[PDB]
Write a protein that binds this ligand. Structure first.
Ligand SMILES: Nc1ncnc2c1ncn2[C@@H]1O[C@H](COP(=O)(O)CP(=O)(O)OP(=O)(O)O)[C@@H](O)[C@H]1O
Ligand SMILES: [Mg+2]
Ligand SMILES: [Zn+2]
Lengths: 49, 172, 145, 98, 43, 244, 101, 212, 239
DNA sequence: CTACCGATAAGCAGATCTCTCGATTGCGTATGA
DNA sequence: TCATACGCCTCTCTGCTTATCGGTAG
RNA sequence: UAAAUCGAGAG
């Protein structure tokens, strides 16, 4: 922010949008992957629609 | 249109004086450009014109069912004989004079009589003009339809062509 | 020598018969994978040109060069469809393109603020375009005191 | 997404269906709109116009107008147009006040 | 899905979700390189 | 003035308006048909009227039909006379065509009307005949030469162009050189003006006139040539028949 | 009257000043593009139609666009063109320095 | 068969030499233009074994390259004699990387690599360990007619380009970090490359891409 | 299907049937192709509607992401490119072209020496290094277009155009000297530059879509035996 | 031994220019007349 | 006996996404 | 003045 590479509103371009989308998709896939919540080690019911 | 798929809107009502009169005094009631023929190859119109001219000269009706003539009985010869017997040109041509300059044209003009049909696509059922008329309700844009005094549509392609010119104010 | 399939590494061993330097392939994805983005752009231009040339139609290479550069603007073999469209700052353009519902949720979940840059967004909001006569402003030199 | 239909006649489109397809709101009402001050007719040739003009029929010439503001230089022409009126070309159909 | 009803957190590790949050915060301002350089702080 | 489908830029230009008080069709010149891809066919096309000064000045300058002489697809020209003007030019520019003084002057004034601003000079200037005796006789190539010399602005040299046309030298006889179009100091001296000169043809007389004198002079030349070949086609009409 | 508007005005003018490219270092085309010419003519015609003062001799002319073209030929149009660069910086050319065709 | 294997090994060795020379380390035409006879004389045993232990080398930067990139340091090229990638065999080189204080390391394996190494390659920062394949280096990709010339830009040149075109780092055309030429050039993320395309309408013209 | 008749003497019944078959196929294909090209053109123009020429002579999308640093590498308009190679025509109408261009009034706002000097240096460099492999051609002098703005520096022309001009001036030894002709043609190159704000993406999409509506006019069916048989035309564009 | 990681097999979802006319619009049922 | 309001009353392409059978380290 | 479906057409 100090040297001018980015303002306080944040720089948003196509490639950073693509990287953010890929990261979020991978984050969701990893979230939905593994059960057995490691914060407390308890199985959870599996939902369905 | 003729009976060989030669479309075309009437362009102008050419006055009889400006119409190119022939030697006998006949001024044609319909002029068709000779350039329409080479691309469509409607030689049936060429045969029909001279066949009808011979029929009108001799007071007879000429049949035109397909596959009566062959390569040894060509209809061009068959009706050119009748034209020559009647006393006209064997090839259906006619000495013609321009109605504006009065001098004989460079070549012998091809004249004849062909059956012509008036199509139902009159210009009185196709033209629209709107300055400010009724509008929609949920979009406030002009309504659709000629009978409703509605405007015409500029689509995605028209908008693209309007910005392709670089014309932004035209688009707006 | 032409084949009926793409696998570059196989013909790399046959240097004695085949000159491995001039191996140009019809496929673009394999060329991108094994040679790089720039070779993919070159083969995209060549493939999009040889179809026109075979039909005796001339298209200047600026158009094909622009198309190839836009298609490989991320270093990947993109396309002109919604699956190669979502990477764009302006959302209104994609919503106007197609799948208006899907692109609306993807833009409202992350609070995607758009600056009205593409012509589609400016058309939606009724703003003067930025291409052509709208790529600049006009000021007046008023001689006050 | 609606569930429940035995015979029916037509399933009422949702608000999403009003903005989605080619007939939806977007592609039919902002990517392209019906326009005021525009005409349409059949074309006929005319080799006597200067290869850059259009032959405007007098029927179109009495309906399509342009909002010329009156000035010191425009006063005579616009006065004559107003006097001629909306039926005699060239003429005026409205006089928008200030 | 991918949530815990007992401890009321995600079934992912807190460290993993913290790493993802840090990466997303870096990408918010456009530090597309610092996001990848953050992965090598396993220590 | 737009026709659907608009496949490219040229299918939507901006024409000036000429109020013809006869009937109810939009009357279009013959050069625009190549770009609009229409025939006088029952074909229909819209006519939008911009309502502010910016759009007026920006359809008169950026979108006007003069600026769309060359399509951006490959740079090839898209305007030009189409069907009978080509045949009229082929017949007029052949060396078999000679015109007396009256015919020459009438043909020139039928297209170079100085009252409307067709020619820069206030006085129409002509050329000496190609045959002084027994009696004066001009030529069709002389007609083209003086047409160009009247529309071309003065204080500027003529067009020095060397081109070709589609009719081979064998069609005109033996030892003929009518396949090679030659312009020297703005005077046509060899070859006929077929489609390869005016129309959808590259490096023709109209293309060279455009590239030398701007697009407005090329448009004026196109209009003047279309008017000249129209008036020549009424005097000596072109016809086709069964004998052909 | 708060400083919560004075600060915003000051920062807006500061950002605008940092955006402007000085006359000594503008590196754009000295010629006037066709789009610039068309927009200048249209805007000048609008101003003339809205009863703005004119400087040229109105030799029996009634079209504001024609008057604008005459002024552009005489280079008496009092308008400044703010060419915009992709980042946001701008250079303030005027019609006088810009040369046509 | 051993003759063909030795030919492939020599082609891979020449490709590695050319890659290092392009990257900007002091490699002369010797050990690059090495004929097959010389390769058999030097890097072959009494029977014809490849003896990849002896073809490992350390490459030092040129003076011009040092001036261009002051932070550039020495590089090590390691050839895997083991047919697969072994954890201990790779760990020896990995620890030697900082034992000798090597800023960059090049790894060439025969067939495949364990995926614990993929988690282990970014274990000694800022030292970079780039891995390659023996079958992927048989033909130099940059020698292809279609592939243009890629030149890495220094910090000064990249800053000058960004200031001239008033760009952000992310608005340039992107080149994948897994691109075959990106691996060739060893581009870090954020390093702008220069491409000299042989355009059909302009001959030589320079285009720029950023690695991200 | 090989009919021996002609439209002047008429065609037999079987020949009539075969010709009707062929005409029906032609009309079916004509109907299909127009609808086929529309989706391609629409997708192309929807994606490329924003990219335009900026004031840096570098074309880029609406948001700002750079696509090309120069339009085609030379930034010259396709419409005005027509008579930039016609050196014979330009030499013949030198006087008319000079009257059109007026280099006298285009001096006080132009720089003439730096671009020309760099162009000569680069030309000599390439001529010295011409006989070099593509990969070994280490770049020391970039093309003059890269540094000097072609719309402000006379002589900053393309490598192709400069090579063609030099070859013409060397092969054709002609009152016009080589210096004045070179200056005139460099001014012509400067004036034949694409303007900032051009909708280059729209132009490219239209110029790629509209010629595809004239497809399948020439059939050239793969009558060869064991040939490539690559997909051709609209399907190939779709792929 | 067994969980994280992939590599198919199957299903799912979204796609495949303008303009003018004309015609048409549900059974089914159940109680207050 | 019998009419209008209420209640419903089967021959094309591209991906993405989820589930399930194989493998490696710990 | 509407809106949808089907049918017939023009370029
Ligand atoms: N599906 C469609 N989309 C767009 N335009 C269509 C169309 N179907 C028909 N047309 C129009 O029908 C007209 C036919 O013209 P074309 O066949 O292309 C020239 P032509 O073959 O030389 O006709 P000709 O034989 O009468 O001389 C075109 O103007 C075209 O715009
Ligand atoms: Mg038509
Ligand atoms: Zn939990």
């Amino acid at each position: 922010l100090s040297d001018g590479r980015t303002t306080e509103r944040g720089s948003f371009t196509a490639t950073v949008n693509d990287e953010r989308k890929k990261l979020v998709h991978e984050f969701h896939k990893k979230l939905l992957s593994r059960g057995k919540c490691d914060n407390c080690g308890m199985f959870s019911p599996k939902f369905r629609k | 249109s003729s009976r060989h798929g030669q479309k075309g809107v009437c362009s102008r009502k050419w006055p009889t004086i400006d119409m190119p009169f022939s030697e006998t005094g006949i001024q044609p009631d319909i002029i068709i450009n000779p350039h329409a023929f080479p691309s469509r190859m409607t030689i049936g119109m060429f045969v029909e014109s001279l066949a009808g001219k011979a029929g009108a000269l001799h007071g007879i009706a000429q049949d035109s069912t397909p596959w009566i003539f062959n390569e040894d009985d060509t209809p061009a010869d068959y009706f050119g004989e009748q034209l020559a017997k009647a006393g006209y040109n064997y090839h259906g041509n006619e000495p013609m004079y321009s109605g504006a300059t009065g001098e004989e044209l460079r070549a012998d003009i091809y004249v004849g009589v062909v059956y012509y049909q008036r199509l139902r696509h009159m210009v009185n059922d196709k033209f629209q003009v709107r300055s400010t008329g009724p509008v929609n309700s949920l979009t406030m844009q002009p309504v659709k339809g000629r009978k409703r005094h509605g405007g015409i549509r500029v689509g995605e392609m028209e908008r693209d062509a309007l910005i392709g010119h670089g014309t932004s104010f035209l688009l707006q | 020598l032409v084949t009926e399939g793409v696998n570059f590494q196989a013909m790399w061993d046959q240097e004695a018969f085949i000159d491995v330097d001039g191996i140009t392939s019809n496929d673009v994805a394999a060329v991108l994978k094994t040679y790089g983005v720039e070779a993919a752009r070159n083969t995209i231009v060549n493939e999009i040109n040889n179809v026109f040339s075979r039909y005796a139609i001339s298209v200047s290479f600026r158009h094909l060069d622009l198309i190839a550069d836009m298609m490989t603007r991320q270093g990947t073999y993109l396309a002109f469809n919604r699956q190669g469209m979502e990477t764009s700052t302006s959302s209104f353009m994609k919503m106007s393109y197609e799948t208006t519902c899907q692109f609306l949720t993807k833009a409202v979940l992350d609070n995607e603020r758009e600056q009205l840059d593409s012509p589609s967004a400016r058309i939606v909001v009724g703003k003067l375009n930025n291409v052509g006569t709208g790529s600049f402003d006009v000021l007046a030199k008023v001689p006050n005191a | 997404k609606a569930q429940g239909r035995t015979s029916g006649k037509v399933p009422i489109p949702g608000v999403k269906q009003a903005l989605e397809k080619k007939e939806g709101l977007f592609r039919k009402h902002m990517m392209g709109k019906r326009v005021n001050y525009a005409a349409r007719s059949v074309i006929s040739p005319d080799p006597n116009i200067e290869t850059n003009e259009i032959g405007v029929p007098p029927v179109f010439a009495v309906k399509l107008t342009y909002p010329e503001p009156v000035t010191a230089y425009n006063i005579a022409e616009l006065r004559q147009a107003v006097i001629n009126g909306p039926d005699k070309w060239p003429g005026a159909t409205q006089i928008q006040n200030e | 899905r991918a949530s815990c009803l007992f401890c009321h957190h995600f079934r992912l590790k807190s460290v993993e979700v913290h790493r993802y949050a840090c990466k997303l915060r870096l990408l918010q301002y456009g530090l597309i390189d610092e996001s990848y350089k953050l992965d090598e702080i396993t220590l | 003035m737009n026709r659907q489908p608009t496949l490219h830029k040229a299918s939507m230009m901006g024409h000036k308006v000429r109020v013809l008080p006869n009937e109810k069709t939009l009357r279009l010149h013959y050069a625009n048909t190549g770009a609009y891809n229409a025939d006088f066919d029952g074909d229909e096309m819209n006519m939008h009227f911009p309502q502010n000064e910016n759009a007026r000045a920006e359809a008169l300058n950026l979108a006007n039909t003069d600026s769309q002489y060359l399509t951006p697809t490959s740079g090839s020209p898209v305007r030009g006379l189409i069907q009978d003007h080509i045949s009229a030019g082929v017949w007029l520019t052949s060396k078999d065509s000679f015109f007396t003084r009256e015919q020459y002057q009438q043909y020139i004034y039928g297209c170079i009307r100085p009252e409307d601003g067709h020619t820069t000079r206030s006085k129409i200037v002509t050329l000496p005949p190609t045959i002084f005796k027994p009696y004066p006789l001009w030529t069709g190539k002389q007609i083209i030469t003086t047409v160009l010399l009247n529309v071309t602005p003065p204080d500027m040299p003529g067009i020095n162009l060397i081109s070709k046309n589609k009719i081979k030298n064998e069609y005109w006889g033996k030892g003929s050189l009518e396949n090679e179009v030659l312009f020297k100091d703005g005077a046509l001296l060899c070859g006929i003006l077929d489609k390869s000169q005016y129309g959808a043809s590259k490096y023709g007389i109209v293309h060279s006139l455009h590239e030398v004198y701007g697009p407005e002079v090329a448009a004026k030349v196109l209009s003047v040539l279309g008017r000249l070949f129209t008036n020549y086609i009424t005097a000596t009409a072109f016809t086709c028949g069964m004998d052909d | 009257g708060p400083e919560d508007f004075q600060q915003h005005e000051q920062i807006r003018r500061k950002t605008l000043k940092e955006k402007a490219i000085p006359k000594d270092q503008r590196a754009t085309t000295p010629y006037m593009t066709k789009y610039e010419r068309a927009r200048i003519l249209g805007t000048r015609a609008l101003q003339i139609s809205m009863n703005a003062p004119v400087f040229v001799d109105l030799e029996g002319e009634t079209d504001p666009l024609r008057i604008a073209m005459k002024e552009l030929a005489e280079k008496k149009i009092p308008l400044v063109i703010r060419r915009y660069l992709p980042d946001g910086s701008f250079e303030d050319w005027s019609v006088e320095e810009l040369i046509v065709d | 068969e051993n003759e063909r294997n030795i030919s492939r090994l020599w082609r891979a060795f020449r490709t590695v030499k050319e890659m290092v020379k392009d990257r900007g380390y002091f490699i002369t035409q010797e050990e690059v233009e090495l004929p097959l006879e010389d390769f058999k004389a030097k890097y072959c045993d009494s029977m014809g074994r490849p003896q990849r232990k002896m073809m490992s080398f350390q490459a030092n930067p040129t003076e011009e390259s040092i001036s261009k990139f002051p932070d550039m340091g020495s590089l090590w090229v390691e050839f895997c004699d083991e047919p697969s990638v072994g954890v201990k065999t790779m760990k020896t080189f990995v620890i030697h990387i900082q034992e000798k204080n090597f800023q960059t390391g090049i790894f060439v394996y025969q067939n495949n690599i364990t995926p614990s190494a993929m988690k282990l390659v970014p274990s000694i920062p800022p030292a970079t360990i780039e891995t390659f394949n023996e079958a992927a280096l048989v033909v130099n990709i940059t020698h292809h007619e279609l592939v243009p010339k890629h030149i890495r830009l220094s910090s000064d040149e990249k800053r000058e380009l960004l200031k001239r075109y008033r760009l952000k780092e992310s608005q340039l055309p992107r080149i994948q970090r897994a691109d075959p030429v990106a691996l060739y050039l060893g581009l870090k993320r954020g390093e702008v490359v220069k491409i000299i395309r042989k355009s059909e309408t302009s001959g030589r013209y320079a285009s720029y891409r950023i690695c991200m | 299907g090989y009919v021996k008749g002609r439209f002047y003497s008429g065609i037999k019944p079987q020949e009539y049937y075969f010709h009707c078959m062929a005409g029906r196929e032609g009309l079916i294909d004509t109907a299909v192709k127009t609808s086929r090209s529309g989706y391609l053109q629409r997708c192309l123009t929807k994606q490329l509607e924003g990219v335009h020429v900026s004031y840096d002579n570098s074309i880029r999308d609406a948001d700002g992401t750079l696509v090309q640093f120069m339009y085609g590498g030379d930034a010259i308009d396709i419409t005005k490119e027509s008579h930039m190679t016609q050196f014979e025509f330009c030499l013949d109408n030198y006087y008319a072209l000079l009257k059109k261009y007026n280099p006298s009034a285009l001096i006080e706002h132009l720089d003439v020496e730096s671009a020309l000097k760099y162009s000569k240096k680069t030309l000599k460099y390439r001529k010295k290094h011409s006989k070099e492999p593509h990969y070994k051609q280490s770049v020391k002098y970039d093309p003059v277009l890269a540094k000097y703005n072609p719309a402000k520096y006379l002589g900053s022309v393309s490598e192709n155009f400069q090579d063609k001009l030099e070859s013409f001036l060397d092969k054709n030894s002609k009152g016009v000297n080589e210096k004045k002709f070179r200056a005139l043609m460099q001014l012509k190159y400067m004036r034949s530059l694409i303007n900032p704000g051009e909708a280059v993406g729209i132009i490219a999409s239209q110029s790629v879509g509209e010629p595809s509506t004239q497809m399948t006019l020439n059939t050239f069916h793969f009558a060869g035996h064991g040939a490539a048989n690559v997909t051709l035309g609209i399907p190939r564009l779709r792929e």
